[PDB]
Design a protein around this ligand. Structure first.
Ligand SMILES: C[C@@H]1O[C@H](O)[C@H](O)[C@H](O)[C@H]1O
Ligand SMILES: C[C@@H]1O[C@H](O)[C@H](O)[C@H](O)[C@H]1O
Lengths: 135, 126
């Protein structure tokens, strides 16, 4: 309906340069489940809502937020709690890629531990997997 | 997926002054559909989030006053939606579900009160 509201309804994928996607491991609905890289398969555990009014990234399947652990390296899903470790700056590049920076320390950006391995937070060095495609 | 929370008279929960601040009151107001009258409700989590402010409907520690505040996964920001067959809903505070979204008067403030099946305790989520 019944209303006009300013908020994205689109489910997104977060895509690597090889075409793989951020995926919540095991299609888990639990706190602490790892974010990993996986080939795209249509499943809801690879889809995320992104709200650029506040900067959250929420799993469509679990409704939990992409979160950097307190260690400032590991990326999991966890209940949204308005934490700086759950809020992201989307730096949009002219080529259509995006640097996804941690609000708590924006020098630390969404990265991978390997091409088809885990998602992590790492210092920005313009490494290829720090340049995401939000589809 | 934005909703209004509607009273029997057709008025709605409204964040006072269209405020974006922590602690702003939830009040009853004639329906205009501005974003301070619209709320995201997610029944996987149990939150009620203002579209305009992106802050959660929150019971204060006094267990009576209703405000908005940053969502911090508090039991005082989580809600049970008890759905009746005629399309009304009792919105109960997770921290103490005997206490439910209510009003201090027909077009006055939103509060938490013991459930007595008062007409303003039976919301229509539209
Ligand atoms: C069950 C399977 O688990 C994998 O770890 C990955 O999360 C996949 O997307 C999921 O379908
Ligand atoms: C400015 C005005 O303030 C009122 O208290 C109410 O919140 C209305 O919705 C808003 O439009």
């Amino acid at each position: 309906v019944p209303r006009g509201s300013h908020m994205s309804n689109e489910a997104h994928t977060l895509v690597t340069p090889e075409g793989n996607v951020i995926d919540i491991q095991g299609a888990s609905q639990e706190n602490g489940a790892n974010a990993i890289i996986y080939p795209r398969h249509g499943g809801e555990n690879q889809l995320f809502f992104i709200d650029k009014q506040i900067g959250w990234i929420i799993s469509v399947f679990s409704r939990k937020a992409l979160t950097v652990k307190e260690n400032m390296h590991d990326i999991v899903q966890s209940d949204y709690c308005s934490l700086s470790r759950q809020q992201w700056i989307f730096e949009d590049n002219p080529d259509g890629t995006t640097i996804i920076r941690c609000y708590e320390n924006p020098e630390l950006v969404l990265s991978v531990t390997g091409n088809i391995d885990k998602v992590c937070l790492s210092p920005f060095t313009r490494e290829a997997h720090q340049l995401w495609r939000i589809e």
